[PDB]
């Protein structure tokens, strides 16, 4: 029980498709292009997560600050509650003081 | 990324193979066999 009785279908990975072949290109854009553009400008994703890193509380605060006005009501309420809980956890609970 | 254990069968058998000449449910039930196998060793 709990384990498959037949082998899963074989998994084939195209190691030389366009995406894997051109992965990493233009990474040294600033170094090899007179620093016109920074390599962090090539990162695509959430507007509040572009060339920035942090913990969960910092990510939530940044999201609320940047796109809080555009969020849905339930999502904004959940984000506020999550920020409150993370504040309490990181400033009142733990092992090392 | 969700990771789940897939070799629990072999993990259980590594102990149940030493508990097959016993008497009762302590030769087929893991939570009862594991305690007897340790005592046997």
């Amino acid at each position: 029980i709990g384990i498959r009785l037949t082998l899963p279908p074989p998994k084939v990975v195209d190691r030389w498709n366009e995406k894997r072949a051109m992965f990493g290109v233009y990474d040294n854009i600033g170094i090899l292009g007179n620093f016109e553009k920074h390599p962090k400008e090539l990162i695509r994703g959430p507007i509040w997560l572009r060339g920035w890193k942090g913990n969960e509380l910092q990510r939530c605060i940044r999201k609320r600050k940047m796109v809080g006005s555009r969020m849905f009501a339930d999502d904004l309420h959940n984000l506020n509650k999550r920020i409150r809980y993370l504040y309490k956890h990181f400033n009142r609970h733990g092992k090392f003081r | 990324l969700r990771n789940r254990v897939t070799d629990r069968y072999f993990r259980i058998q590594e102990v149940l193979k030493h508990a097959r000449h016993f008497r009762g449910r302590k030769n087929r039930c893991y939570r009862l066999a594991v305690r007897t196998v340790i005592r046997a060793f």
């Binding site: 082998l7 899963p8 998994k11 | 897939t6 070799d7 069968y9 072999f10």
Partner: peptide
């Protein structure tokens, strides 16, 4: 269904061993 291939391969080999035990070849 769980992602993985090693466990399935190992269990298939164990099943083949059991089948050989149940039906010994000449």
């Amino acid at each position: 269904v769980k992602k993985g291939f090693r466990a399935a391969f190992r269990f298939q080999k164990e099943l083949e061993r059991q089948r050989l035990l149940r039906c010994p070849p000449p």
